[PDB]
Backbone:
């Protein structure tokens, strides 16, 4: 759909699959750091809420 | 830091940890879809490239 249009532009641009894999893997790594952030956000609030409630 | 300002706001808003966890959980699932879409993008290009190189 949108992706066939993507593949045609990548192919026109002389991209090989190896090249696309290395760039997309870096994107994927950045995405996965967002999961880590939402976890840290949650645990931080869990601790904050608990600390507020105690006092 | 930034987050601590969020926490004070969430706490003033009466959010509990259980409530935050479930809302963040659904958002987390959405982000997990992106990494998977990128893996699918890589895989679909490998197939498209491989097919184009057939001709």
Residues:
């Amino acid at each position: 759909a949108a992706w066939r249009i993507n593949y045609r532009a990548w192919y026109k641009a002389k991209l090989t699959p190896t090249q696309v894999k290395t760039v997309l893997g870096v994107s994927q790594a950045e995405m996965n750091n967002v999961a880590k952030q939402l976890q840290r956000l949650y645990l931080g609030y869990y601790s904050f809420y608990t600390a507020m409630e105690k006092k």
About this structure: Chain B touches chain A at residues 3-4, 6-7, 10-11, 15-17, 20-21, 24, 27-28, 31-32, 34-35, 38-39, 41-42, 44-46, 48-50, 52 (CB under 8 Å). The longest helix of chain B spans residues 17-54. The two ends of chain B are 57 Å apart (CA to CA). The CA atoms of residues 46 and 52 of chain B lie 10 Å apart.
